[PDB]
Amino acid sequence: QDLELPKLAGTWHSMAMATNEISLMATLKAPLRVHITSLLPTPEDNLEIVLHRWENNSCVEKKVLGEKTENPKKFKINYTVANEATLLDTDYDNFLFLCLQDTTTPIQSMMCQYLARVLVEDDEIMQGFIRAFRPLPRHLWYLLDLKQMEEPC
């Protein structure tokens, strides 16, 4: 899988979220309590991320630009505590695991999101999501399993 960026374009839905620092995600106010709703790769092979979150007592939409790196899965960003986004794994038509990371610390703080093209629970993929953040990131991991229009934004 050499990453074909254009094939990630378009709408995505968050199915689950994981973090190695619960406070990044535990509340609606938390830095990385966000929901990625679309990706828009640019002609320069940069990445536009669109996300939704709760902020000042309402649902709001944010744009986050990512500059390409030597690694086609990694983009430099600036969103709250995160300075890097990672396209961890994908099959394009069904799932994408996308991480927002703070690389500045010795222990890299991180939130990864299981994104899906349609709202369909899949055991293989949910289990692959868990397996993804398992191996080398060998701390306790928290996982938030989302529900349908229960999360406000």
Next chain:
Amino acid sequence: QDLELPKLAGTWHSMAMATNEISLMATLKAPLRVHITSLLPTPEDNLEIVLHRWENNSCVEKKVLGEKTENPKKFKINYTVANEATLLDTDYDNFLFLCLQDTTTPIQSMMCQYLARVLVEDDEIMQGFIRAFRPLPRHLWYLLDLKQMEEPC
């Protein structure tokens, strides 16, 4: 599956934990941040639960007695906020899903633990654990995926 209580006797290891209230579980001080290490059914068909937790800056062992109810999966207890324990599902030789619940509130607060006889990651069972707390408990659920001798107790 009519529940054969004696077949649950003995040693268990926590593989994962889930809650519908993150604060019950988020810190080591949290009420239901506990690890069940054995079950000992009594001759009266009551249940002795042994658990381990962090408390006053060290690992400590606790005993929690459960009185039988008309339901053979449910036992009345008194541990922090929980007044009931539930044996949700099991195959006896590999897994047991055990919940500690506060039934006193309208929205039942709850921590469930994926217990295992041996330290073996299994996709089918981990996925069955998630499916278990999914259907009717239809809020956001948090899941803590544990690691080997990283958790102090």
